[PDB]
């Protein structure tokens, strides 16, 4: 049980460190750090597998009405060197009319 064990039965076992001749390579990854690494990789691969399923089973004739108010991801040919697959969003700025810029420049 738990009362049938001495304090030397309860005593913790210490963890060894990376050798000092090899400490420049980083920390010695043990089971806990390996579990963190494996959890992060399995999570990222699960998201990527779901994205690959969604890109495979895509209707080529789909029509949402946000397509008339968004700029598409395009291709590398149409966009150019600045091509990421992400749809570009708006930063909030807008082209500003001349009367309001006349007001702002009088204030400045």
């Amino acid at each position: 049980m738990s009362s049938l064990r001495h304090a030397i039965q309860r005593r913790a076992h210490k963890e060894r460190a990376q050798p000092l001749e090899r400490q420049r390579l980083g920390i010695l990854e043990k089971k806990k750090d390996y579990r963190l690494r494996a959890r992060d990789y399995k999570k990222k691969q699960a998201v990527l597998k779901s994205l690959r399923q969604k890109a495979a089973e895509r209707n080529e004739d789909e029509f949402y009405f946000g397509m008339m108010s968004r700029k598409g991801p395009g291709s590398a040919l149409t966009r150019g060197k600045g091509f990421t697959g992400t749809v570009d969003g708006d930063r909030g700025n807008k082209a500003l009319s001349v009367e309001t810029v006349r007001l702002l420049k009088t204030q400045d």
Partner: protein, 48 residues
């Protein structure tokens, strides 16, 4: 996309004073300490 050119509404911004920057820095420090304290309290309550 992070904008690289500087817009006119960024060029015409008023340089803020010293007292308002001290109040801004104090509000930054208080909000960070509040967020860390809230995360610690929520972790303790989740353990219980």
């Amino acid at each position: 996309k992070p904008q690289k050119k500087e817009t006119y509404m960024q060029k015409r911004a008023v340089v803020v004073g010293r007292e308002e920057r001290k109040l801004r820095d104090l509000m930054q420090k208080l909000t960070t300490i509040r967020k860390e304290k809230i995360a610690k309290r929520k972790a303790k309550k989740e353990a219980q």
